[PDB]
Amino acid sequence: SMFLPPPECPVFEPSWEEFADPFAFIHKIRPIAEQTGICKVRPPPDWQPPFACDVDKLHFTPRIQRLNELEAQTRVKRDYTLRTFGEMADAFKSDYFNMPVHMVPTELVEKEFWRLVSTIEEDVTVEYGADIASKEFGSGFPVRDIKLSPEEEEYLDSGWNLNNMPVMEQSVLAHITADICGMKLPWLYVGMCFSSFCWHIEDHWSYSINYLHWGEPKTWYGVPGYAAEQLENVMKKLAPELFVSQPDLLHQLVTIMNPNTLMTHEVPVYRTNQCAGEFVITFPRAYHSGFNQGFNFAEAVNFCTVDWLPLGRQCVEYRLLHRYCVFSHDEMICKMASKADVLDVVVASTVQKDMAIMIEDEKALRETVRKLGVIDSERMDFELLPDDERQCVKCKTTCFMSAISCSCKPGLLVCLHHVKELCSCPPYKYKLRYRYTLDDLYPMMNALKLRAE
Numbered sequence: 001s002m003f004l005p006p007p008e009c010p011v012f013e014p015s016w017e018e019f020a021d022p023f024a025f026i027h028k029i030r031p032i033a034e035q036t037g038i039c040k041v042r043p044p045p046d047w048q049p050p051f052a053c054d055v056d057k058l059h060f061t062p063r064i065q066r067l068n069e070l071e072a073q074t075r076v077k078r079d080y081t082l083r084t085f086g087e088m089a090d091a092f093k094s095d096y097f098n099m100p101v102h103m104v105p106t107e108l109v110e111k112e113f114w115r116l117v118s119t120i121e122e123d124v125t126v127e128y129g130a131d132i133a134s135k136e137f138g139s140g141f142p143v144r145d146i147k148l149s150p151e152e153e154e155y156l157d158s159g160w161n162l163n164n165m166p167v168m169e170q171s172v173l174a175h176i177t178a179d180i181c182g183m184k185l186p187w188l189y190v191g192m193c194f195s196s197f198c199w200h201i202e203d204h205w206s207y208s209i210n211y212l213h214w215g216e217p218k219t220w221y222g223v224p225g226y227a228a229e230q231l232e233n234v235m236k237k238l239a240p241e242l243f244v245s246q247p248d249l250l251h252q253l254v255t256i257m258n259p260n261t262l263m264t265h266e267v268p269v270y271r272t273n274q275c276a277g278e279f280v281i282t283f284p285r286a287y288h289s290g291f292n293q294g295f296n297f298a299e300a301v302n303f304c305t306v307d308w309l310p311l312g313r314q315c316v317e318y319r320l321l322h323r324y325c326v327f328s329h330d331e332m333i334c335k336m337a338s339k340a341d342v343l344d345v346v347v348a349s350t351v352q353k354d355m356a357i358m359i360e361d362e363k364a365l366r367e368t369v370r371k372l373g374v375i376d377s378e379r380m381d382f383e384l385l386p387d388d389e390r391q392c393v394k395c396k397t398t399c400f401m402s403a404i405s406c407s408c409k410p411g412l413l414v415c416l417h418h419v420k421e422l423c424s425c426p427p428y429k430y431k432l433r434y435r436y437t438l439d440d441l442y443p444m445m446n447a448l449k450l451r452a453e
């Protein structure tokens with residue numbers, strides 16, 4: 001009645017040994033956690049990264065948020081210190097419930113959240129912080145610089161120090177030379193009571209990992225990757241405004257929606273309260289949303305393992321939706337092949353398999369455009385072009401392996417799926433621009449095979 005809490009997601013308590021390597025651990029829990037979309041990881045009891053900062057010198061610009069179910073919000077985008085925000089946040093929650101903050105049951109805040117967002121006549125608005133790490137506001141984890149205490153240095157090189165996560169050997173998003181600071185740098189989140197994150201999945205269907213440094217809990221709802229399209233069909237029915245096309249990445253539209261609505265619609269949903277010192281991990285294409293129970297401070301980062309590689313290719317195939325890419329998946333694959341000698345051997349083996357598919361698809365696409373009467377061709381170093389200068393005019397995909405150009409439309413490109421969409425000139429006026437010949441590509445893949453042995 002009113003709100004039935006979804007079942008709890010899995011909670012893992014790894015030993016110091018299991019905990020040692022995050023990527024090995026994540027791979028281990030994957031068969032369980034991928035069925036629920038999110039999971040919680042409790043670190044071993046003594047793993048306690050020191051959080052220290054001045055609440056007066058850290059400044060940030062707050063976002064403002066209206067709390068209405070099914071209303072469109074833009075996913076990314078006054079001035080507080082951490083202290084003045086905290087004072088605002090505590091007073092807000094205290095006044096809302098006429099209670100001291102620690103006496104307000106989490107179950108009640110959850111019930112109340114879903115009451116207030118559904119109720120038209122309540123116009124509750126809240127504020128929050130969300131920015132990537134910078135000099136005005138830096139990571140909650142120890143970083144290198146200022147003299148560090150011995151305990152801080154203990155955690156400098158932790159796998160679970162979220163600064164290190166994108167640049168470890170197991171991960172594939174590291175050696176991406178391309179500018180993608182929005183998604184390989186950690187984001188910092190300053191929460192207050194009811195401040196919420198709308199239903200979404202991560203760019204390129206990556207994993208994410210969220211650490212709550214301190215404060216009151218963060219409540220999560222998650223849906224397994226296998227159910228992503230079920231969820232979207234439900235959302236399209238109840239809020240079609242979110243699904244109209246949108247000129248870029250800055251304008252992705254998202255919304256608050258009751259998990260019970262999804263569960264009625266046969267979409268599996270799980271929940272958890274994430275407390276201070278705990279991790280939440282989201283898996284590829286796992287929808288998630290949630291809200292904060294009170295004043296808190298979280299840090300999160302995207303990442304990609306070898307398990308993710310085939311999904312990353314399927315994700316870019318964005319093409320059907322005409323959605324912008326954050327980076328070129330093929331460019332990343334070829335960059336890794338060009339570094340085959342210093343790659344991890346398991347990485348090498350998995351990249352090799354994705355590369356083989358890439359090459360077979362590219363062979364077929366080039367044959368098709370040849371049969372359309374595109375004859376002239378020229379090598380082109382796509383990776384040198386700013387991304388906005390190498391998007392398919394039609395489907396907006398970021399080109400790297402190849403594209404079609406025409407002298408009559410200088411600077412415009414289409415991917416090889418959209419040769420007919422470039423201009424009205426006959427095909428013999430077109431040029432195939434390619435990064436590599438098929439003969440360049442087979443030795444690159446062979447280097448991976450030798451490294452993988």
Ligand SMILES: Cc1cc(C(=O)N(C)Cc2cccnc2)on1
Nearest residue numbers: 065073074075130196197198254
């Ligand atoms: C508005 C708005 C902002 C978001 C969002 O995405 N946030 C705050 C980031 C986040 C926090 C926790 C987990 N995943 C993402 O949604 N609506």
Ligand SMILES: [Cl-]
Nearest residue numbers: 116117119122
């Ligand atoms: Cl409301």
Ligand SMILES: [Mn+2]
Nearest residue numbers: 200201202208
């Ligand atoms: Mn997220």
Ligand SMILES: [Zn+2]
Nearest residue numbers: 392395415418
């Ligand atoms: Zn295209």
